[PDB]
Amino acid sequence: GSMSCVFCAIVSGDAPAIRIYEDENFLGILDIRPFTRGHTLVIPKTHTVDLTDTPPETVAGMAAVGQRIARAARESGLHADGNNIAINDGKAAFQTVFHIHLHVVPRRNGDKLSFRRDPDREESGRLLRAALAQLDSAE
Amino acid sequence: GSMSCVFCAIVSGDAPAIRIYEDENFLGILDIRPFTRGHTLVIPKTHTVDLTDTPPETVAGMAAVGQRIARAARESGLHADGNNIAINDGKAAFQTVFHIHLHVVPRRNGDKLSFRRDPDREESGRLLRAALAQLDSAE
């Protein structure tokens, strides 16, 4: 899977990513074509393609991780006032990487975003990791 | 809550909706301003506002229900080839109803959708309910 799927390769540590979150089942990385700074992908470590073949428990967990990252962005040095959470199920819904995943796109009041390059993704990653660490400390 | 929040009112049976799904914790209804036919909102029966105050278990479950509706749309007479799942967390992310909810927007190959009126929402509801009933029978 690692040699044929870029998200499997990243999960296996065989392809590069700016990683911001990881647990037993999910990996959160920065998108390489961010809509906004801190645009994050939540990627189940098991390869399935979309909503037709992904266990509900995986979709459920992916959403929960997405929430955690959303909360972090809102308290982070990226100054998020909100977030768009998205799953693009199938090619007709804009799917281009055929390993299921969920987007967390940080938003800011008056950002005039319409639905793609971050001047310093490493900084955005560091800010999100610091915010996630802070949420962890508070619990 | 029912008199001050339109989604609470719908959950309480105090305001109209075309309902397509219901369990102990969630209600799925047709959006009144659909992006596509069968555009569905999944609404937790408990009122919370966004990702900052909604229990993770609720976000997780909302996503699972959204998946079920997505799968139904794909096998339905609305002919969905895919779906966009969205949560708009906060006003900065386009939130306009301040009771947390999740969008399932059916998509079709070559539909040229860009991110709003259904000629027959009752028909779209009937088609989704029939597809959901069919998924239930298969399990």
Ligand SMILES: Nc1ncnc2c1ncn2[C@@H]1O[C@H](COP(=O)(O)O)[C@@H](O)[C@H]1O
């Ligand atoms: N190697 C990669 N690392 C990080 N993000 C990626 C990589 N390849 C593709 N993406 C992103 O994954 C998303 C896939 O699109 P979609 O399938 O519509 O969610 C896009 O936003 C891409 O920019």
Ligand SMILES: Nc1ncnc2c1ncn2[C@@H]1O[C@H](COP(=O)(O)O)[C@@H](O)[C@H]1O
């Ligand atoms: N009474 C209602 N019944 C069904 N859908 C509604 C109603 N009022 C608002 N909506 C929809 O709820 C969504 C709220 O926007 P957002 O908060 O961005 O998800 C919009 O797509 C509205 O068209």
Ligand SMILES: [Zn+2]
């Ligand atoms: Zn994969």
Ligand SMILES: [Zn+2]
């Ligand atoms: Zn409410």
